[PDB]
Amino acid sequence: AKKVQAYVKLQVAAGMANPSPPVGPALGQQGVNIMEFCKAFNAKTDSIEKGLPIPVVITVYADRSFTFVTKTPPAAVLLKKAAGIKSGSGKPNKDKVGKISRAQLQEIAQTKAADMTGADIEAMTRSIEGTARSMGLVVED
Amino acid sequence: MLQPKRTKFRKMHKGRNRGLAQGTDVSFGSFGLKAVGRGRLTARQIEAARRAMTRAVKRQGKIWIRVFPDKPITEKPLAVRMGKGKGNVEYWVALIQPGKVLYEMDGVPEELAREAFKLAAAKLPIKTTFVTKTVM
Amino acid sequence: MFTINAEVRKEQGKGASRRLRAANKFPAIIYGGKEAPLAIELDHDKVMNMQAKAEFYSEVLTIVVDGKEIKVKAQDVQRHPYKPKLQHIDFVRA
Amino acid sequence: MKVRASVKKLCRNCKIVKRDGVIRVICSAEPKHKQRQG
RNA sequence: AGCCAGGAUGUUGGCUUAGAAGCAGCCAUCAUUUAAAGAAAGCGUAAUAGCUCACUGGUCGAGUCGGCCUGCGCGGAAGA
Ligand SMILES: [Mg+2]
Ligand SMILES: [Mg+2]
Ligand SMILES: [Mg+2]
Ligand SMILES: [Mg+2]
Ligand SMILES: [Zn+2]
Numbered sequence: 001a002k003k004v005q006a007y008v009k010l011q012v013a014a015g016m017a018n019p020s021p022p023v024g025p026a027l028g029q030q031g032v033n034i035m036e037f038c039k040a041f042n043a044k045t046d047s048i049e050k051g052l053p054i055p056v057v058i059t060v061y062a063d064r065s066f067t068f069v070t071k072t073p074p075a076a077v078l079l080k081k082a083a084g085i086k087s088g089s090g091k092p093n094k095d096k097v098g099k100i101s102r103a104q105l106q107e108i109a110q111t112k113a114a115d116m117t118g119a120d121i122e123a124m125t126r127s128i129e130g131t132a133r134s135m136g137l138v139v140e141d
Numbered sequence: 142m143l144q145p146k147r148t149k150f151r152k153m154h155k156g157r158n159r160g161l162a163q164g165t166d167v168s169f170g171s172f173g174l175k176a177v178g179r180g181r182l183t184a185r186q187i188e189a190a191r192r193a194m195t196r197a198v199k200r201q202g203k204i205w206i207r208v209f210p211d212k213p214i215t216e217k218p219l220a221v222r223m224g225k226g227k228g229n230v231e232y233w234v235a236l237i238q239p240g241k242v243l244y245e246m247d248g249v250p251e252e253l254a255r256e257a258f259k260l261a262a263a264k265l266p267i268k269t270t271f272v273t274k275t276v277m
Numbered sequence: 278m279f280t281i282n283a284e285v286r287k288e289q290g291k292g293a294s295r296r297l298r299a300a301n302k303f304p305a306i307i308y309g310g311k312e313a314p315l316a317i318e319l320d321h322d323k324v325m326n327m328q329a330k331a332e333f334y335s336e337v338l339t340i341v342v343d344g345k346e347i348k349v350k351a352q353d354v355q356r357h358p359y360k361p362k363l364q365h366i367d368f369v370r371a
Numbered sequence: 372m373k374v375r376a377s378v379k380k381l382c383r384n385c386k387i388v389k390r391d392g393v394i395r396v397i398c399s400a401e402p403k404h405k406q407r408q409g
Numbered sequence: 410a411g412c413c414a415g416g417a418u419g420u421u422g423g424c425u426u427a428g429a430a431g432c433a434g435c436c437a438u439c440a441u442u443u444a445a446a447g448a449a450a451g452c453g454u455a456a457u458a459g460c461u462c463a464c465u466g467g468u469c470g471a472g473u474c475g476g477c478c479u480g481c482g483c484g485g486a487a488g489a
Contacts, residue, residue: 008457009421009430022428026455055421055430076423088423092436109419117418117442127419127441134423134448136437161358177359240358270359276334277354301478322478361477376485383462394484400452409484 006030006066009055014073016050017041031060040068053077071114075131078108083132092136099138105129142184143210144233152215152227162240167274169205170245172254178267181234182243184210190261194244197257202248208235237267279327279338286316298364305366307340307349312370317342325363328354340368378409 010023018027018037028034054077057068080086083104090097109128110121118124129141158179167173174194187208195204210233217228237243244261246254255271262269286293286304294304301321308314317340327333333351340347352367380387384400387409394409 004459010428010456023456026457074421075419079423085423089425089435092424094436115419119442123441124419125441130419130440130448131423133439134419134437136423136439165356165358175359275356276331277351325478378484389483392483 006032006058006060008058011053011055013053014045014050017045031063032058032066036065044070051081072112075105075109075128076134078105079132079135082108084137085135088135090135096138097136099140100132101140105132142188143206144184145211148211148213152213152230156236158236158238160238162238164207164242165240167242167245167272169207170203171247171274172251172258173207173242173245173272173274174258174261174269175272176237176239176241176243176267177270178237179239180237180267181212182208182210182237182265182267183232183234185232186265187235189264191244193264194246194257194261197260198246198249198253202246202254205245207242207245208237210235212236242272243269279333279336281319281324281327281338281340283317283319283340283342285342286318289316294365303363303365305368307347307368307370310370315342315347317368319366321362324366325361328363337371372405372407373403374406374408376408378406 010026012019012022018034018041020034025034027037052073054070054073056070058066059068060066076088079088079100083100084098105128106125109116109131110125112124112128116124117127133139158181162176165175187206187210191204191206198204212234213230214232214234215228216231217223243265244258246257249257251273258269258271283305297304297318298321302318303321303324305317305319306314307317327338328351337348337350340349347368347370349368350371352369354363354367355365356362357364378387378394378396379385380396381404382398382400385396385398385404388395388397393407396404396406396409398404
């Protein structure tokens, strides 16, 4: 939290560490490694699950590798398994596509003790309510 | 393109286009494009403009066209003497006096109706101005 | 509440009304009631902006000719053929 | 530069100027916008 | 007007996405931290973006903005 000094995010899912197909060559280049992308990967990946996507810091000064404490899996990641489709768009607005509910995704994004906006926690409730409306589902609030 | 589907006679005396225009009020839509000058609009003219505006607004709102050709214009081709009969109708025009509302429109933002009319205007041989509907 | 000032017309017909408009006043008229109609002359700019507000055509306006106050409603306009301006107005004394 | 009867701002960085008797467009952002002879 | 700041969070936006993280794509155009900030302004990367903007704080200290009716001009205008 100072300025620009290393940080990116190009992955797929925590249940396959280091992937070469989607991100490939561009995950280790500037004091960052395509091999070491697993040690601090599983410093607490499996400790919870290998079924949720998560990007992370990098932080570099010229040192051998890089230190990058992590945080949340997004809230668009938790609409494939826990709140409907696995495609997402469908036909986003020609027809309502799919539906959800206020209870669904409440706790799934209320757990966020490492991200969110709204001292009032009912606020960052509706401040996750849209990563489901980004695919124009249906309001079963 | 516009033209009479049929007419009592093939050709008209050239005539003159004196006078001020009947049909001077935006009387069908919210906005109009009004003739400020005198002259002839030709069907291609009317149509070129009509397209211009229609596409500006896309499949939105509605349009009316107040003027309609009905005046047949003949010409003589090259390499022909004078006389030997009145020439052959080649196209149609509408006589436009100053004041004529030409096209009306509604179902769109004023600003858009302006843009749209600005564009159609450029296709027209005569000066025009933006007008608006009025009580009374 | 709409207040229009007006002299009466010392002369009439085409020549005079043209001369009026040339001078940025235009002619108008008042009638209805049992009184005779009144050949009126209004200043252009002032009456113009007034009639821009729709209320002008619905409200009862008050015309003012030498001191006296006439209560009227706009009955008809004759606008210019293509310019933002008025050529004539009918007022209904009501 | 582009020379012709109608000359116009094209970007927000366009500027219109008169130098001698001649309307010119001057763009700080895009050389293709530079006009003359308006 | 100018100069100093910020321009954020759902959200790297789900997305017929090979890769897009605003960006031809894809539809919607909703949402929270606020002074304000656009699933959107930009030249634009292999994707990050690096960097100015619409917007709103500070500064400054009195005018400023552009449509209407009009007079006279200007460019548009090359020939033996
Ligand atoms: Mg006479
Ligand atoms: Mg010189
Ligand atoms: Mg200022
Ligand atoms: Mg000239
Ligand atoms: Zn420019």
